[PDB]
Design a protein around this ligand. Structure first.
Ligand SMILES: NC(=O)c1ccc[n+]([C@@H]2O[C@H](COP(=O)(O)O)[C@@H](O)[C@H]2O)c1
Length: 252
């Protein structure tokens, strides 16, 4: 082929082995996930998209995997993020206290991977997978992240933090998974405050990005859900991580 069926890159090479290895490694490191049989996890993950039309995936398809990956996360220590993933992960690697979705078994298994199957066969499609925009939104990858990002937001309580990319354009994007899914699934009964950390890109002396229109929009949406909103600039993310690693002393 010089064309391919779909517009998205195909399944990550060695997907089955990669996911199984990830599950082993995670369940070795994290003692609460020792009950988990990694073969059963693979089977459930496979069951969600194998032999299914990769534009006809449902949240229901992933329910066997979700059940097997059931995991308690400290509800008051949740860090969400939008667009910008690397700082969030670097932060939680020191601040081994806050947790992102990719710090959970399910997020860890799928992070940075792509997968899809075929309606007519049980073959994994290593050649192309649906693009969310060009092909269909009900594809195996997009559905998985929608389902898991939802459930992770529903687990949160107290003060929930979100890192946003202040170099973007839409610092808060209503169309992102954070904006379209997570914001609307925080539980107002349990969540007291959403606090945004607006992460600056380059910049000499920079603007208070907590005044950005899309930030005000986020404030409005959140406040109308009866959840308080707070915002902080992180003007130099590199000084920020240095202070997380070595608090006190220095220009912290
Ligand atoms: N690790 C991922 O690839 C991934 C994908 C989609 C959503 N999510 C969750 O949603 C948020 C990020 O999605 P957006 O960048 O679309 O806002 C984060 O809270 C993240 O945990 C993660």
């Amino acid at each position: 082929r010089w064309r391919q069926t779909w517009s998205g890159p195909g399944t990550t090479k060695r997907f089955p082995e990669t996911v199984l290895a990830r599950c082993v490694k995670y369940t070795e490191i994290h003692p609460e996930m020792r009950h988990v049989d990694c073969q059963s996890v693979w089977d459930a993950f496979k069951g969600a998209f194998i032999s299914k039309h990769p534009c006809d995936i449902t949240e229901e398809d992933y329910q066997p995997l979700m059940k097997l990956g059931t995991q308690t996360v400290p509800c008051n220590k949740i860090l969400l993020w939008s667009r910008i993933k690397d700082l969030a992960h670097q932060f939680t690697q020191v601040q081994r206290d806050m947790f992102t979705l990719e710090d959970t078994l399910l997020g860890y298994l799928a992070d940075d991977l792509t997968w899809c199957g075929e309606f007519a066969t049980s073959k994994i499609n290593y050649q192309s997978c649906p693009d969310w925009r060009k092909d269909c939104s009900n594809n195996p990858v997009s559905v998985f992240w929608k389902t898991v990002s939802r459930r992770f937001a529903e687990a949160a309580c107290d003060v929930v933090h979100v890192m946003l990319d202040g170099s973007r354009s839409k610092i808060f994007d209503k169309d992102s998974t954070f904006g379209s899914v997570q914001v609307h699934n925080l539980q107002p009964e349990k969540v007291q405050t959403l606090e945004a950390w607006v992460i600056h890109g380059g910049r000499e002396d920079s603007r208070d990005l907590c005044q950005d229109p899309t930030i005000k929009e986020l404030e409005s949406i959140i406040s109308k859900r009866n959840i308080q909103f707070s915002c902080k600039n992180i003007y130099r993310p590199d000084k920020f991580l240095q202070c997380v690693k070595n608090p006190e002393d220095s220009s912290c």
